[PDB]
Symmetry: C4
Subunit: 363 residues, 4 copies
């Protein structure tokens, strides 16, 4: 085994094709399946896995019950496999999780009991992190980023989003190798969703407090970091008011509330978003020439990927292969499902970028 | 791993013995199984796999619904395994698929969304192919042929069969390495089912337009190709009128409509067909001394392999082993099933050729 | 991998302990399980497998139907695993089967269609055997014996048991390496169940014609063979009349009918049998000092292994390990079950010999 | 493979974090799962397994039936997997079991039929042990201890607890390599639960006769052994009266009855116990500076791990890895469950020690 190394240069992306689609994205879910929530995807050098948080089996769960965070566990499955009892791999106990593969073992961060974080490397507990700022900690709920055997993840603390604190942790073989406070003051940065290019990790957060755009974060291996705010009238977050003119300030109108989502910075740049913030129906992703951080930059192409489906969280992931100089970039989108008889499991659909332009398709 | 090399010389075939039979070919299907359609078989050097297109699970599907191509996904399973959720391997999104293993990875061609073709090599998307002549593209719906690390497949374009266009593609490690237009004019050539011998690939198509016989195609690595029409009163296609005298022309009577099926050219030659084109009941295969392309050649032995079973598509496949100088040849046949309560999944039965003659048997 | 070599010297056996017990031997069988018949056990150097013939799934099968040999298929499972759809390994098509592992692949003999035998080595069809003496052939329905990379099995031919013919086949890497006709005249020898010791294979047959004792057969690698008849008033077969005095003739009273069962020849010798031939209840095994072929020899110890259970076929098998100079010997016994709602699947219990004496136990 | 070697020095334990939790510990159990009893955990160098004794499947079992020891079988599963039919591994026939992995194979001791003990090494029967003192034998119902390729286990004999006898057995590659009678007179010592440190094995028994504290046992490779009685007013057993002053005698009040549980002796020492002996609700573990065997020693910290759950047996186990000089120590607790419709399966929750102090949590 060899430390996971990611490609320094990103693939040109001009289009998107689905690489995976759960069976609940179209039909109903069999009752025997585990009910999932907080799905995401994270890849090893061998394969891509779908992590999630269990709500219990659909058959042993009655509708009248609301189920509760303390009862929740973190499971894994191979992306492409359905969450049947036999496919499930128990990962840890918790109601929130993030994970990444360094090239040796899986590192998994879970939030449990009190609201602290267990860190487990290859299934065994190597470290715990405790809340200072009070109230429960919170993980990215997205793949963390490993490069050269050290992994980077962002952890949130605090009673409310008005009062949140965020630390950027560095992990090695499952133990914390230090961290840095991120200066958040005046705004809020939750559920960051991240990728790596050109020696820097680039994360799209979610502002649940005072913002209908998405804060953006750049940092490198030495923890020198800057927050950037996108200067485009295309509002990523949900809910949100209305599209605006471009400006490098933050859009405070309907800024409160939010759901996890991404933006991609590159040669081409992308913003994905929920189409109808009322009904939560549809998902669109939208292309831009040059940076998201210039007020100068121009909308080009809008792909309405999903129309008929109730959408929620979305996030990025990078699969790792020899491939070539090119680093592939993919993203997932969680979708409302229902069990054969009621119940609100979610399922996944994933897209990968192609260099080619693509035709208009509703999946 | 070593590039898949097929035997230059074909095994003498004088009979057929079944090597596999789905549980739906006899009893009813358990509701928890995935409903399948467009089944075929393709072999690696390690094993044979059964590909198919999902209609959803039988328990989560209600009868009153008709299901639709856009919801459909291409799965794989090991031949001999039943399509339980735990056995399935997600392969791609699409409503039509063909595949073949080059000795390294599986190549899979799927048709999805707009009606274009994704090509995926070892599960990742390496290439796409888009329709020029308009309307959806169409795959062999049969194993494609790999020899020496390059794979050959045939792709159909066009709004209607009167107007169809066919390209013969060449693929390497999942990217297209060029193609050639096949001259189809005056006829139509769908769902080719192919094998390899004596330095040539030989494919039996299905003419859905103006023919009750089956077009036949020979081509080699340099894409020099010729279409041949069989000169025998034994009508392959379905439906069809009646058996005729031998002639090297095409039988236009009841030539319209059709279903996928094969012919074998060799020392001994074979034509398989559905017995009762009205009821679609029964499958017979029929031996001939010498070519199918001489008007001279004589019927010899008729094997009625299936009598009690409702039949549909049929196709060839070559398993690959060291074995000997001899290249084994097998074929599958798709059979109507039903779930434990209604629903029309299909199952497979497969036959392999033996050198020996065989007694009369209804399987 | 190395050619399977069996121990020349047999373990001293003075008692029996169960090593495995199906869940149907106690409670009822879950409807989703495959219904089995003609269960037996055969071991590789890696593991022991349970072979059987399917009657279909218990949920998809209705009671009013009687199911038929032509619909039957041969499955394998790992001994200790239940025949769930996910555990099943399709082995061949047929209603009767025998198998043995040579140290490289599994050899399986199946009887199908016309009533001929397919021979498959490692899942592929290497050879077929056809009936001369008319009517369907018949396999041991018990593990065949492999030693030093050649395998030995016994095949029956003939319209009725009055008129049976038996050949002793030799197989290598799945092809027949010849056979010998066994001189059966005047009696009948079905379902032989065999083991290997002291350079000789020793088979206990079942006489369905004119005998309430069990024919016994000795042969070696060169196919020199003798039939012996046990000279003991303990009647192995079922049904049977009554226990007799000892004589080296054959007991013709109630000699007709029969069911597969064994005898063990050694320092100690064993005869196992169904206790109550009327109700088919119970199974006892019974120890003897010295040979079964001397009228001199004395009953010693009677173990009543099963009392409450409806019994049927029983057979031997030798597991292979390094262990020591000692060759272990075990046997299985097939037991009537019922599905959660009617239906007559069978399950297995197996016993292995220990050197120690054992207490009286009803399992 | 290499003989399993355990760490001489124990990890400092100042807190406990759950590493696994069964789905029945929170929700209801799906009916298709096997009903379990006598759960425990034992680890190999590869993985930890969960052993248990089957009551049959939840779907095929009706409530009105009480099920009986003779029908019971010993299964295994990988810790973290659910006891679905497809996950189960058949281990032996019996109603009571203990197991441990020496570094080569699993050794499993089972009690069946008459009440004797089968010993199976790597799934094959290597030895049996019979009762002298009459009445059924009994196993630890807990992981036995392997170190350097020899394994140690404790076996109970006798009609009643007033009259019990206990031998300490030594096993190698599955055969008994001798034993020693433990001097129990005047008390009783059942279901010992054990770990290894500092060249000694340390076991916490349960006195079902005359004691509300828990006997404690120290022995080494040469079988030199001493019984110690803990000198602390914290009563381990259940039921029990009331907490007392500290003294080195045994607490006779409500001494009768009992259930399996543990104590840890170390730098820090621990007693775990059921919180409310009436209702059997809740589990607390309690920390002590220095030995449990001095009247001098002081309660320090009480962790209430479980509050809302009905508790039963609890036991230790040591997972084995390279880790470091530190030998990890974990324990499991069995918890009442219920199937989707009635029935009293049990599930597991396991805790591992951390060096760090931990916050108060109700899991
Ligand atoms: C982490 O483990 C890798 C192999 O897993 C090893 O090469 C490296 O030295 C380890 N790093 C630390 C900080 O222990
Ligand atoms: C195709 O793949 C094989 C490895 O499977 C490799 O050695 C060869 O370089 C590849 N050729 C091309 C054109 O990609
Ligand atoms: C059979 O295969 C073995 C290896 O399994 C080989 O060594 C031997 O030469 C083979 N013989 C025949 C006749 O196929
Ligand atoms: C136990 O097993 C190992 C091989 O795995 C062997 O070398 C060792 O000698 C055995 N010990 C005994 C007492 O048989
Ligand atoms: Ca917002
Ligand atoms: Ca036609
Ligand atoms: Ca399963
Ligand atoms: Ca008889
Ligand atoms: Ca007590």
């Amino acid at each position: 085994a060899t430390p996971l190394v990611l490609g320094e240069n990103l693939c040109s992306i001009n289009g998107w094709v689905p690489t995976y689609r759960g069976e609940g994205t179209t039909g109903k879910i069999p009752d025997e399946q585990m009910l999932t929530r907080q799905n995401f995807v994270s890849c090893s050098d061998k394969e891509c896995r779908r992590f999630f948080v269990s709500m219990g089996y659909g058959t042993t769960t009655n509708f009248a019950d609301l189920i509760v965070s303390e009862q929740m566990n973190v499971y894994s499955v191979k992306l492409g496999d359905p969450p049947t009892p036999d496919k499930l791999k128990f990962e840890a106990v918790g109601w929130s999780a993030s994970s990444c593969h360094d090239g040796f073992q899986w590192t998994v961060l879970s939030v449990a009991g009190d609201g602290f974080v267990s860190i487990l490397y290859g299934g065994i507990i190597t470290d715990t992190i405790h809340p200072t700022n009070g109230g429960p900690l919170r993980t990215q709920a997205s793949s963390c980023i490993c490069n050269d055997g050290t992994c980077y993840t962002i952890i949130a603390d605090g009673t409310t989003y008005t009062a949140s604190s965020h630390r950027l942790y560095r992990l090695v073989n499952g133990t914390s190798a230090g961290w840095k406070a991120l200066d958040t003051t005046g705004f809020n940065f939750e559920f960051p969703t991240c990728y790596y290019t050109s020696g820097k990790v680039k994360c799209t957060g979610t502002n649940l407090w005072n913002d209908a755009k998405r804060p953006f974060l750049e940092f490198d291996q030495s923890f020198t970091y800057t927050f950037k705010e996108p200067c485009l009238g295309f509002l990523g977050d949900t809910p949100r008011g209305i599209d605006t003119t471009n400006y490098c300030d933050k859009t405070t109108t309907e800024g409160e509330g939010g759901i996890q989502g991404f933006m991609i910075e590159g040669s081409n740049s992308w913003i994905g978003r929920i189409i109808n913030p009322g009904s939560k129906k549809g998902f669109e992703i939208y292309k831009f020439l040059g940076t998201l951080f210039s007020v100068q930059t121009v909308g080009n192409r809008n792909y309405q990927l999903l129309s008929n489906s109730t959408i929620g969280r979305s996030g990025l992931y990078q699969p790792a292969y020899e491939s070539r100089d090119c680093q592939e970039l993919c993203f997932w989108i969680e979708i409302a499902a229902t069990t054969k008889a009621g119940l609100s499991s979610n399922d996944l659909i994933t897209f990968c970028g192609t260099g080619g332009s693509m035709p208009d398709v509703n999946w």
